[PDB]
Amino acid sequence: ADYLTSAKFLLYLGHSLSTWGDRMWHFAVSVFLVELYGNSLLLTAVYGLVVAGSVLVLGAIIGDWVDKNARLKVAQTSLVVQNVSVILCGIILMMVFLHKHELLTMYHGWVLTSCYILIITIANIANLASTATAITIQRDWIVVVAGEDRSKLANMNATIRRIDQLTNILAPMAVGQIMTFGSPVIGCGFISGWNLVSMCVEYVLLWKVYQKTPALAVKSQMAEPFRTFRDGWVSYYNQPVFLAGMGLAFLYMTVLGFDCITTGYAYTQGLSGSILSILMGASAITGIMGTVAFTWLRRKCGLVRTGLISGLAQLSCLILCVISVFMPSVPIISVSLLFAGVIAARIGLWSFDLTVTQLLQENVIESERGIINGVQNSMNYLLDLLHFIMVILAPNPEAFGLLVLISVSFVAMGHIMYFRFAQNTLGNK
Ligand SMILES: O=C(NCc1ncccc1F)c1coc(CCNCCc2nc3ccccc3[nH]2)n1
């Protein structure tokens, strides 16, 4: 089987072994914050606000970094930084858990706060490196490797999204089984070793994939970074794909996902391990269905029409969701219907994100694949930070109707901007 040694599968394996470690470490840090500190939302909110702004700035700066340096060296350095940061965070977490009872009492609260700050800073560096790697792989190496064959590019993006989704719903399950079967102290260390092994194998894998395809080779102190930062954003406006980016960012700011806040809505109305597993499995299955639907629609239509159709479907079932909210024992109809609306919204959302990311891949000048995508991630996290602020503005279980109304309104605005883009770049239906 020459497929195993082929470049496409090498890149698939590289991204799979990267995202598995990423998701496992995210789950580990979230569980650490939940377990060590009884209060989390306040802190997890601090984590969100220190990740989002740092990404907002250093992501444009990284987009400057990606296109400037060597193609392979930048990716290797990104992998090194991400895995080393995760290693340091794991070591600090192991030292904290081992001395859980030795600093809550004997040491001053400043020591615990300093440990939390060190974890926050190192995890922020890790996530910044993860964003750098995501850019340099997905938005540049996929385009180069897939080449002019647009269908191959679409299939590669769909496959990467499918493995991302399956890993996103499997990694928490495996880590929870590990922690329950073993111990939080022992299981946490397993992540450090797994990330080190993945570091070595991923370094080898990237070195290999670079050799398989030669096309990849062809290509006071704060004044300069802001020269690029000012240049990077204004470059985004000049590009014809700006409205698509804005629409994707507005969709990115969306409460009606299945993250911690919808998990808390579940705590309030209905919540169980079986229910969580069933809902997340349905979400993953429907995301896979959305990816395959995106591929099918791209086979039938082009790209902009596919994005328009996916947005219409997502907005339709979010209209169904807001109908469910509108309609007043336990209202089992309302919560289950809201979840079904979220599931179909995930279908449409994955389709739309694939469309927009492919358009950003195929409609950007060669030398600015780094800055433009870095700014697009910066904007995504800008509106994600606004989402976090809206969450902490009304962190009340019965203050969720307004939040969901705002989320659906922002989805509508994003799809309106995408329709404006379709009209701008296409004069026919
Ligand atoms: O609704 C969802 N996502 C919109 C969306 N995303 C991506 C593509 C299309 C699309 F439409 C949704 C649901 O689950 C998830 C998976 C988690 N990502 C959340 C983004 C995030 N991760 C963070 C980590 C640290 C700090 C801030 C962070 N912000 N994403």
Author numbering: 18 to 236, 286 to 394, 449 to 549
From the paper:
A central regulatory mechanism of iron homeostasis in humans involves ferroportin (FPN), the sole cellular iron exporter, and the peptide hormone hepcidin, which inhibits Fe2+ transport and induces internalization and degradation of FPN. Here, we describe the cryo-electron microscopy structures of human FPN in complex with synthetic nanobodies and vamifeport (VIT-2763), the first clinical-stage oral FPN inhibitor. The structures display two distinct conformations of FPN, representing outward-facing and occluded states of the transporter.
Whereas, the hsFPN/Sy12/vamifeport complex shows an outward-facing conformation in the absence of bound metal ions that closely resembles equivalent states determined in previous studies, two hsFPN/Sy3 structures obtained in the absence and presence of vamifeport display a previously unknown conformation of FPN, where the access to substrate binding sites from the outside has closed, while the intracellular part of the transporter has remained unchanged. In contrast, the quality of the map of the hsFPN/Sy12/vamifeport complex is to some degree compromised by a preferential orientation of the particles and difficulties to reconstruct and refine a 3D model as a consequence of the binding of Sy12 to a flexible loop region at the periphery of the protein. Still, even in latter case, the map was sufficiently well resolved to permit its interpretation by an atomic model for the bulk of the transporter. In this position, the interaction with the extracellular loop connecting α3 and α4 located at the periphery of the N-domain is apparent. Notably, the same loop is recognized by Fab45D8, which was used to determine hsFPN structures in a previous study. However, the density is, in this case, less well defined, which likely reflects a preferred binding of the molecule to the occluded state, although it might in part also be a consequence of the lower resolution of the map and the compromised quality resulting from the described preferential orientation of particles.
